From a paper:
At the molecular level, ASH1L is a large, ~3000 amino acid protein that contains a catalytic SET domain responsible for the transfer of a methyl group from the S-adenosyl methionine (SAM) cofactor to the lysine substrate. While ASH1L represents an attractive drug target, developing ASH1L inhibitors is challenging, as the catalytic SET domain adapts an inactive conformation with autoinhibitory loop blocking the access to the active site. At the molecular level, ASH1L maintains the H3K36me2 mark, which enables the recruitment of the MLL1 protein complex to chromatin to activate target gene expression in leukemia cells. The crystal structures of ASH1L-inhibitor complexes reveal compound binding to the autoinhibitory loop region in the SET domain.
We then used isothermal titration calorimetry (ITC) to quantify the binding affinity of AS-5 to ASH1L SET and obtained 1:1 stoichiometry and Kd of 6.2 μM, which is consistent with the inhibitory activity for this compound. To further characterize the binding of ASH1L inhibitors we crystallized the ASH1L SET domain in complex with AS-5. Crystals of the wild-type SET domain diffracted to a low resolution (~3 Å), precluding detailed structural analysis. The ASH1L-AS-5 structure revealed that the compound binds to a predominantly buried site formed by residues from the autoinhibitory loop and the C-terminus of the SET domain and is restricted at the bottom by the SAM co-factor. This site is lined by the hydrophobic portions of the side chains of H2193, Y2255, S2259, V2262, and I2279, the polar groups from the side chains of N2256, N2261, and Q2266, and the SAM co-factor. An interesting feature of the binding site on ASH1L is the presence of multiple backbone carbonyls from S2259, C2159, H2193, N2256, F2260, K2264, and G2280, most of which are involved in the interactions with AS-5. Overall, the crystal structure shows high shape complementarity of AS-5 to the binding site in the ASH1L SET domain. The thioamide group of AS-5 is deeply inserted into the pocket in ASH1L and is engaged in a network of high-quality interactions, including two hydrogen bonds with carbonyl groups of C2195 and F2260, Fig. 3b, c.
Numbering used by the authors: 2063 to 2281
The structure:
Amino acid sequence: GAMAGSYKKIRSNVYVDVKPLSGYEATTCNCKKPDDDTRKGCVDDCLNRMIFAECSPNTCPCGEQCCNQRIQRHEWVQCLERFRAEEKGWGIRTKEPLKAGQFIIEYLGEVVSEQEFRNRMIEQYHNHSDHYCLNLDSGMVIDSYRMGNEARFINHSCDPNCEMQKWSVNGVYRIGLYALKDMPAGTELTYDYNFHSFNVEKAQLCKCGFEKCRGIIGG
Ligand SMILES: C[S@@+](CC[C@H](N)C(=O)[O-])C[C@H]1O[C@@H](n2cnc3c(N)ncnc32)[C@H](O)[C@@H]1O
Ligand SMILES: NCc1ccc2c(-c3cccc(C(N)=S)c3)cn(CCO)c2c1
Ligand SMILES: [Zn+2]
Ligand SMILES: [Zn+2]
Ligand SMILES: [Zn+2]
C-alpha cells in the first residue's frame, strides 16, 4: 500500500487561536502517602482522579508516590508500532499486552477553533482521503492534519478497545487515549470516532469488521 502520510511531529499541543483552559479549581485530594516507599498513592478513589483532574506539582499529599500525573509526566506506553492495517491504511498496534483502564498515549496536535478548522477544511484539507481531527471542548478541536504524534494513525472501530478521556492537567484540557479492556500483544488500537472525533461530514466506508458495524465512520 501507499506510504504513510507526512506530519510534523510535536511533543506538546500547539495553541493556534484558542487555549483550552479547564476552569478547574486548584487540585486537592484526601489521599495518604503510603508508608511503603514503593507503593503508589492517588489510586482509584483519589478525589482528583474522580473528576478527571490530574494532581498538580508540589501540592499532592503523596509527593513523588502519586500515580495520577500520567499525562503531564508523558507516561506513554513504549510498545506502540505503526503498521499496515488491512483496508484501513496505517494503524497503531501494541506489541505488549495492555490492561483495562490503562493510559496509553496523549493525542497531540494544533488546538484550533471550529471556525479555524472549517476554514482549513475548505482551503487546505478538501482533497484529503484521510482525516485527522479530534474533538476537545466546546468550539475547539485538535487538528493533527499537519502536526501531531503517532496517535493520529489510530483507526476507528464501531466496537472499540480504547477511548479518549478529557482531563484537566494543570489548568488546561488535554486528551488521552485509555484502554477500555485488556488487549493481547499485536492488537490494533481503536476508538469510536462517533464519540470522540470531529464530524468532518465526509462519508467513508467502515472496515472495522464488527457484526454491528455502522457502515460508515461516525454513522
Ligand atoms: C485519524 S486517520 C487514521 C490513520 C489512517 N488510517 C492513515 O492511514 O493515515 C483516519 C482515517 O483513517 C481511515 N480509517 C480510520 N478508521 C477506519 C475504518 N474503521 N475503516 C476504514 N477506514 C478507516 C479513514 O480514511 C479516516 O479518515
Ligand atoms: N456522528 C458524529 C460523527 C463523528 C465523526 C464523523 C466522521 C469522520 C470520518 C472520518 C474521520 C473523522 C475524523 N474526525 S478523524 C471523522 C464522519 N462523520 C459523518 C459521516 O458519518 C462523522 C460523524
Ligand atoms: Zn489523590
Ligand atoms: Zn496525587
Ligand atoms: Zn464499523
